[PDB]
Amino acid sequence: RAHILSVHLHKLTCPHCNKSFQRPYRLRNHISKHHDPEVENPYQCTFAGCCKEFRIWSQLQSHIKNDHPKLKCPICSKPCVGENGLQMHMIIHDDSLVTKNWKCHICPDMSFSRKHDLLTHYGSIHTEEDIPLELKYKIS
C-alpha cells in the first residue's frame, strides 16, 4: 500500500511546482496560495454541509475550531461534529420521544414497563454502582 502511494500514485506532489508535502492537508493549503486563482477567498470550509469561505487560513482554523469542534456524546462517548451533531445524537437517548425498552446490562430475562421499576433490578441484583449512564442520567 505504501509502495503504490510512494512510487506510482504521486498524490502528495504539487500539480504545478512539483514540490511534495507530508500530508494532503498541507498540499491543499499550498495549492490555495502558491498556485491560487484570482479569487478573493482562497479558503473553503472542509466539512459536511458547510458552505462558508474565508480570506486568511487563520479565519478557517477559527471557523473549524468554533463551529465544527469534534465532540464525544456525554452519555455514550461516540464522536460527533459540532453543536448540531450533539443535538441530533441526543435524540437517541431521549426517553420522551424514544419510548425505549427496559433491560438489565447482564441478566438476560428482564422486561420492565417503566423507568422507576427498572431501577429495582439495578437496586437489588446490582447496586447504585455499575448501572448504565443512560438510565442514571436525569440531566434535563
**Which residues in the 57-76 window bind DNA by CB under 7 A?**
57-58
Regarding 28 and contact with DNA (CB under 7 A), the answer is no
Q: How far apart are CA 138 and CA 140, in angstroms?
A: 6
Exactly one of 2, 15, 22, 138 binds DNA (CB under 7 A); that residue is 22
CA distance 53 to 120: 54
List 10, 11, 16, 19, residue binding DNA (CB under 7 A): 19
Task: For residue 136, give the 3-state DSSP assignment.
Answer: helix
- For residue 71, give the amino acid letter: L
Q: Which partner from the list DNA, Zn ion, none does 75 bind, CB cut-off 5 to 8 Å by kind?
A: Zn ion
Q: Between the CA atoms of 125, 129, 130 and 135, what dihedral angle is there, to the nearest 10 degrees?
A: 90
Q: Which residues bind DNA (CB under 7 A)?
A: 1, 19, 21-22, 26, 29-30, 33-34, 56-58, 79
